[PDB]
Design a protein around this ligand. Structure first.
Ligand SMILES: CC(C)(COP(=O)(O)OP(=O)(O)OC[C@H]1O[C@@H](n2cnc3c(N)ncnc32)[C@H](O)[C@@H]1OP(=O)(O)O)[C@@H](O)C(=O)NCCC(=O)NCCS
Ligand SMILES: [Mn+2]
Ligand SMILES: [Mn+2]
Ligand code: NA
Length: 219
């Protein structure tokens, strides 16, 4: 009803989220090596986010399956599926969709708080600093910019297999719940197209920021 991800992605991309770790969850056997020596926060975020991912996959008709990690950390979905996952204090969530419907999806959740000391200087272009200062009072625009940049990478990486730095995209945030990401580097993609700009959506609720980008199919 009031799920954050569902508010920022199309209905044809099922999503699921939780705000706490249900007690007693375990990963699938194939997933255990990915968190073998991990601390409690990492184990629990990994397990619960995959619980949410499998719930969303079931809506698309896909029964229980491991969700392993690819070359540079990207989640590895079944044939015909794209998706994205995110976890932070107070949130685990996942979204999935069919490749016949969209090219890529990225999401990212952050607490709705001022960025840690020094992070804004590291991630924002000078022009972005000025733009954030101009936006209306009452939202942590610095944290929203950071969130949006991470969503940009998540949407970009499965389509390019290349790094994208914080300095390599200019994100413009609108108060209306949308943002744009303008790519400043070579945007050639692995399907033969060029990625120059992404359209994003954002919501703040439950003390969290959630950003999302869907990269549509082309004609
Ligand atoms: C990878 C990264 C984006 C993760 O974002 P984050 O906000 O720190 O963490 P989240 O909890 O939201 O997301 C973590 C999940 O992202 C996904 N992920 C990791 N690497 C990924 C990649 N290369 N491509 C897509 N998704 C990826 C994984 O599913 C991971 O969860 P898991 O390890 O449990 O499977 C971030 O840590 C990072 O390294 N960023 C550097 C690149 C960047 O953001 N550039 C800005 C471009 S403008
Ligand atoms: Mn996380
Ligand atoms: Mn994040
Ligand atoms: Na690579």
């Amino acid at each position: 009803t009031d799920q954050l991800i569902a508010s920022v992605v199309p209905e044809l991309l099922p999503s699921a989220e939780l705000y706490e770790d249900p007690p007693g969850l375990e990963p699938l056997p194939e997933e255990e090596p990915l968190i073998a020596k991990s601390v409690a926060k990492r184990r629990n975020e990994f397990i619960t986010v995959r619980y949410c991912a499998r719930q969303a996959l079931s809506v698309l008709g896909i029964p229980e399956v491991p969700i392993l990690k690819g070359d540079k950390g990207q989640p590895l979905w079944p044939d015909g599926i794209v998706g994205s996952m995110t976890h932070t204090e107070g949130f685990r969530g996942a979204v999935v969709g069919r490749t016949g419907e969209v090219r890529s999806v990225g999401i990212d959740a952050e607490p709705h708080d001022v960025l840690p000391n020094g992070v804004l200087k590291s991630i924002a272009l000078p022009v972005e600093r000025d733009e954030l200062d101009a936006l209306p009072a009452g939202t942590h625009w610095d944290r929203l910019l950071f969130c949006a940049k991470e969503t940009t990478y998540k949407a970009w990486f499965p389509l390019t297999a290349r790094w994208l730095g914080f300095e390599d995209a200019h994100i413009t945030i609108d108060p209306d719940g949308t943002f744009t990401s303008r790519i400043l580097v070579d945007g050639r993609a692995n399907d033969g197209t060029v990625l120059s700009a992404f359209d994003g959506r954002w919501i703040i609720d439950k003390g969290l920021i959630l950003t999302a980008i869907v990269v549509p199919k082309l004609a």
